[PDB]
């Protein structure tokens, strides 16, 4: 049910660039359809304008690939490489 | 002490004081016994690194957190919010 759609979601954020991670994620259903809110990691050295890009293209990205998510919102958190 | 209308209200009045703070944009917040989790959103210049919002963040959950003792947890992430 949901943890299935929360690894679409996930999957589907980590191929859009400039992305390091999906950090938090929270699903509710409302009726059939899913309300979202998630955090993505990006580089520290991004100006708060191209990350806002960045979850811009997320957005797209996660709810072209399913179709149930009438919202999501995204926002971005400093994140390295590594660790 | 006093509802969650007030909380709510002295949360958002303690974070707009912080220098760097162009709004709060979002706020959730949720009684677990008599202790509060809260998550929040605030505006900051577009023009700031994903670092230096990082700070003003770090800030407002100092500010906030040390003039509202009952908050127990508080997340804070920063969106582009432009004048």
Same mark, same amino acid.
């Given at each position: &049910?949901?943890?299935?759609?929360?690894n679409?979601? $996930?999957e589907?954020?980590?191929r859009?660039?400039? =992305? !390091? /991670? =999906?950090? &938090?994620? !929270?699903?509710?259903?409302? /009726? %059939?359809?899913?309300? @979202?809110?998630?955090i993505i990691? $990006?580089?520290?050295?991004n100006? +708060?304008? %191209?990350? &806002?890009?960045?979850?811009? @293209?997320?957005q797209?990205? =996660?709810?072209?690939?399913?179709?149930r998510?009438? #919202?999501? &919102? +995204? #926002?971005?958190?400093?994140?390295?490489?590594?660790?």
């Amino acid at each position: &049910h949901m943890e299935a759609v929360q690894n679409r979601i $996930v999957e589907a954020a980590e191929r859009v660039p400039g =992305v !390091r /991670g =999906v950090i &938090h994620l !929270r699903a509710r259903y409302v /009726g %059939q359809d899913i309300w @979202a809110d998630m955090i993505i990691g $990006v580089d520290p050295e991004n100006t +708060v304008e %191209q990350a &806002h890009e960045i979850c811009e @293209a997320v957005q797209a990205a =996660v709810c072209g690939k399913i179709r149930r998510i009438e #919202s999501l &919102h +995204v #926002s971005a958190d400093a994140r390295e490489i590594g660790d």
